[PDB]
Design an enzyme around this catalytic site. Structure first.
Site, mmCIF file in Angstrom:
data_model
loop_
_atom_site.group_PDB
_atom_site.id
_atom_site.type_symbol
_atom_site.label_atom_id
_atom_site.label_comp_id
_atom_site.label_asym_id
_atom_site.label_seq_id
_atom_site.Cartn_x
_atom_site.Cartn_y
_atom_site.Cartn_z
ATOM 1 N N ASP A 59 0.781 -1.238 0.000
ATOM 2 C CA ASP A 59 0.000 0.000 0.000
ATOM 3 C C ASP A 59 0.809 1.282 0.000
ATOM 4 O OD1 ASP A 59 1.071 0.066 2.508
ATOM 5 O OD2 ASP A 59 -0.836 -0.082 3.596
ATOM 6 N N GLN A 61 2.622 2.565 2.155
ATOM 7 C CA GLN A 61 2.824 3.063 3.508
ATOM 8 C C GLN A 61 3.858 2.208 4.237
ATOM 9 O OE1 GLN A 61 0.219 5.983 2.845
ATOM 10 N NE2 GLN A 61 0.122 5.640 5.069
ATOM 11 N N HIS A 142 28.713 7.893 4.095
ATOM 12 C CA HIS A 142 30.037 7.262 4.189
ATOM 13 C C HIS A 142 30.093 6.111 3.199
ATOM 14 C CE1 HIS A 142 33.580 5.747 6.848
ATOM 15 N NE2 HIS A 142 33.318 4.685 6.122
ATOM 16 N N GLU A 143 29.031 5.289 3.225
ATOM 17 C CA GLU A 143 29.088 4.126 2.330
ATOM 18 C C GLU A 143 29.083 4.569 0.875
ATOM 19 O OE1 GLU A 143 30.052 1.636 3.815
ATOM 20 O OE2 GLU A 143 29.389 2.069 5.831
ATOM 21 N N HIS A 146 32.335 5.620 -0.418
ATOM 22 C CA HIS A 146 33.318 4.589 -0.771
ATOM 23 C C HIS A 146 33.216 4.220 -2.254
ATOM 24 C CE1 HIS A 146 35.303 3.572 2.923
ATOM 25 N NE2 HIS A 146 34.235 3.086 3.512
ATOM 26 N N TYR A 157 42.538 -0.027 -0.193
ATOM 27 C CA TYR A 157 42.025 -0.072 1.173
ATOM 28 C C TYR A 157 42.984 -0.721 2.156
ATOM 29 C CZ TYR A 157 38.034 0.298 4.379
ATOM 30 O OH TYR A 157 37.178 0.688 5.391
ATOM 31 N N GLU A 166 39.123 5.905 4.154
ATOM 32 C CA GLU A 166 38.165 6.010 5.250
ATOM 33 C C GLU A 166 37.848 7.451 5.636
ATOM 34 O OE1 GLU A 166 36.218 4.271 7.365
ATOM 35 O OE2 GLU A 166 36.345 2.906 5.599
ATOM 36 N N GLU A 177 25.653 15.129 6.147
ATOM 37 C CA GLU A 177 24.854 15.320 7.361
ATOM 38 C C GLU A 177 24.514 16.793 7.559
ATOM 39 O OE1 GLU A 177 25.691 12.722 10.835
ATOM 40 O OE2 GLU A 177 25.693 14.599 11.988
ATOM 41 N N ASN A 183 20.341 18.587 13.016
ATOM 42 C CA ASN A 183 21.281 18.485 14.127
ATOM 43 C C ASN A 183 22.646 17.940 13.727
ATOM 44 O OD1 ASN A 183 19.411 19.462 16.086
ATOM 45 N ND2 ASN A 183 18.311 17.503 15.858
ATOM 46 N N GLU A 187 30.735 14.331 14.641
ATOM 47 C CA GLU A 187 30.863 12.950 15.123
ATOM 48 C C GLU A 187 30.363 11.952 14.084
ATOM 49 O OE1 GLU A 187 32.498 13.567 17.908
ATOM 50 O OE2 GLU A 187 32.104 15.640 17.298
ATOM 51 N N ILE A 197 23.556 4.179 25.336
ATOM 52 C CA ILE A 197 24.383 5.256 25.903
ATOM 53 C C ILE A 197 24.229 6.545 25.121
ATOM 54 C CG2 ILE A 197 26.716 5.902 26.598
ATOM 55 C CD1 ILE A 197 27.220 2.652 26.105
ATOM 56 N N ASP A 226 42.805 -4.372 11.161
ATOM 57 C CA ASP A 226 41.986 -3.371 10.478
ATOM 58 C C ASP A 226 42.656 -2.880 9.206
ATOM 59 O OD1 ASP A 226 39.742 -1.510 10.302
ATOM 60 O OD2 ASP A 226 41.005 0.034 11.165
ATOM 61 N N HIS A 231 40.581 2.446 9.905
ATOM 62 C CA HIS A 231 39.602 3.167 10.707
ATOM 63 C C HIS A 231 40.233 3.838 11.926
ATOM 64 C CE1 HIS A 231 37.088 0.096 8.630
ATOM 65 N NE2 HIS A 231 36.311 1.152 8.466
HETATM 66 C C1 LIG Z 1 30.297 5.394 9.358
HETATM 67 C C2 LIG Z 1 29.981 4.029 8.708
HETATM 68 C C3 LIG Z 1 31.013 2.983 9.033
HETATM 69 O O1 LIG Z 1 32.117 3.226 9.509
HETATM 70 O O2 LIG Z 1 30.609 1.750 8.709
HETATM 71 C C4 LIG Z 1 31.384 0.668 8.991
HETATM 72 C C5 LIG Z 1 31.015 -0.141 10.083
HETATM 73 C C6 LIG Z 1 29.790 0.272 10.921
HETATM 74 C C7 LIG Z 1 31.749 -1.293 10.395
HETATM 75 C C8 LIG Z 1 32.854 -1.626 9.602
HETATM 76 C C9 LIG Z 1 33.217 -0.823 8.511
HETATM 77 C C10 LIG Z 1 32.489 0.329 8.191
HETATM 78 C C11 LIG Z 1 32.935 1.210 7.040
HETATM 79 O O3 LIG Z 1 32.083 1.817 6.337
HETATM 80 O O4 LIG Z 1 34.162 1.354 6.803
HETATM 81 CA CA LIG Z 2 24.922 5.819 21.656
HETATM 82 CA CA LIG Z 3 27.352 12.614 12.626
HETATM 83 CA CA LIG Z 4 2.897 -1.105 3.691
HETATM 84 ZN ZN LIG Z 5 34.259 3.018 5.597
#
Ligand SMILES: CCC(=O)Oc1c(C)cccc1C(=O)O
Ligand SMILES: [Ca+2]
Ligand SMILES: [Ca+2]
Ligand SMILES: [Ca+2]
Ligand SMILES: [Zn+2]
EC number: 3.4.24.27
Length: 316
Positions: A59, A61, A142-143, A146, A157, A166, A177, A183, A187, A197, A226, A231
């Site tokens: 629908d 929605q 972010h994604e 990439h 990478y 990264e 954002e 807002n 971060e 949290i 990593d 990261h």
């Molecule tokens: C800000 C998005 C981010 O960092 O995503 C990732 C997460 C949540 C885990 C592992 C890798 C990535 C990434 O996009 O590099």
């Molecule tokens: Ca949090």
């Molecule tokens: Ca942010």
């Molecule tokens: Ca629906």
């Molecule tokens: Zn990333």
């Protein structure tokens, strides 16, 4: 699919109501025909085969719990497309309006999101460390960034080029954002990170150190976790970007801020005209300085601030 463009309405991960562009052909599909060659959102149905099924709804929605991550993946990809188009004159991630595809409900309790070479993928989180990751526009952007990077600079990478890769995604995720302007902050991931949290985040660009990431080249990680710390060492570039935009004195080095838009212009130019698959931090600094010079003249404030910023993070 073939059908008529419609507008549906739903609720995103955070409970916010939004309209979304859909396509009608028996069902209403999460397919936005208003942008490039389309934005397509898929259901991976808690498994890991991709992309899964194009999101179908009876629908138009989308207020079910199960729909929310889809609603946001779809909507924030539209906002990210808009950012690169309106702000950088770039049509989708390949610059030629490639179809943007996303899958949500990937795997079970999956605490990650990624670009797999061909599409965006979002886990639902385990509800402890994360909630569905498409709930954060900085995560979506972010994604998709990439993808942009892989089609442009091609930053490998791993190690420093990986850290730059990264940082670029965090930088543009943050600029998107701010572009959406709900807002905004410096971060990363705060909207879907640790629902239990308040006040924290996955990363900080303003103070990487807050979560154990280096804010100076002398503090970089050189082990092998990593991918050689992609990261982790990105903190050094994120801090530099923050400084260029917001200014500040860091380890005694003072930086005059030039604002978010110029930061975006400079780094977008560096990304698409000067960086290469193997650029290291020092070559990013030269790329940023040459880009600022192209844009504002070698005697600009903008060039002077870029140098100050990389000086402050110990990158020569
Ligand atoms: C800000 C998005 C981010 O960092 O995503 C990732 C997460 C949540 C885990 C592992 C890798 C990535 C990434 O996009 O590099
Ligand atoms: Ca949090
Ligand atoms: Ca942010
Ligand atoms: Ca629906
Ligand atoms: Zn990333």
């Amino acid at each position: 699919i073939t059908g008529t463009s419609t507008v549906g309405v739903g609720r995103g991960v955070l409970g916010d109501q939004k309209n979304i562009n859909t396509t009608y052909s028996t069902y209403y599909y999460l397919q936005d025909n208003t942008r490039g060659d389309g934005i397509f959102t898929y259901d991976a149905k808690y498994r890991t085969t991709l992309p899964g099924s194009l999101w179908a709804d009876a629908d138009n929605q989308f207020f079910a719990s199960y729909d929310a991550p889809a609603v946001d993946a779809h909507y924030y990809a539209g906002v990210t497309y808009d950012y690169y188009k309106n702000v950088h004159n770039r049509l989708s991630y390949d610059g030629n309006n490639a179809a943007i595809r996303s899958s949500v409900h990937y795997s079970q309790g999956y605490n990650n999101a990624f670009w797999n070479g061909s599409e965006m993928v979002y886990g639902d989180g385990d509800g402890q460390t994360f909630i569905p990751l498409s709930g954060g526009i900085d995560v979506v952007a972010h994604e998709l960034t990439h993808a942009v990077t892989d089609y442009t600079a091609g930053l490998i990478y791993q190690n420093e080029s990986g850290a730059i890769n990264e940082a670029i995604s965090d930088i543009f995720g943050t600029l998107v954002e701010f572009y959406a302007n709900k807002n905004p902050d410096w971060e990363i991931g705060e909207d879907v990170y640790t629902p239990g949290i308040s006040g924290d985040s996955l990363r900080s660009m303003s103070d990487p150190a807050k979560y154990g990431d280096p804010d100076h080249y002398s503090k970089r990680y050189t082990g092998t976790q990593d991918n050689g710390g992609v990261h982790i060492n990105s903190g050094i570039i994120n801090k530099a970007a923050y400084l260029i935009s917001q200014g500040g004195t860091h380890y005694g080095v003072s930086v005059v801020g030039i604002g978010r838009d110029k930061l975006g212009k400079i780094f977008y130019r560096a990304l698409t005209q000067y960086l290469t698959p193997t650029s290291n931090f020092s070559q990013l600094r030269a790329a940023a300085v040459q880009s600022a010079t192209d844009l504002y003249g070698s005697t600009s404030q903008e060039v002077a601030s870029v140098k100050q910023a990389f000086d402050a993070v110990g990158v020569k």
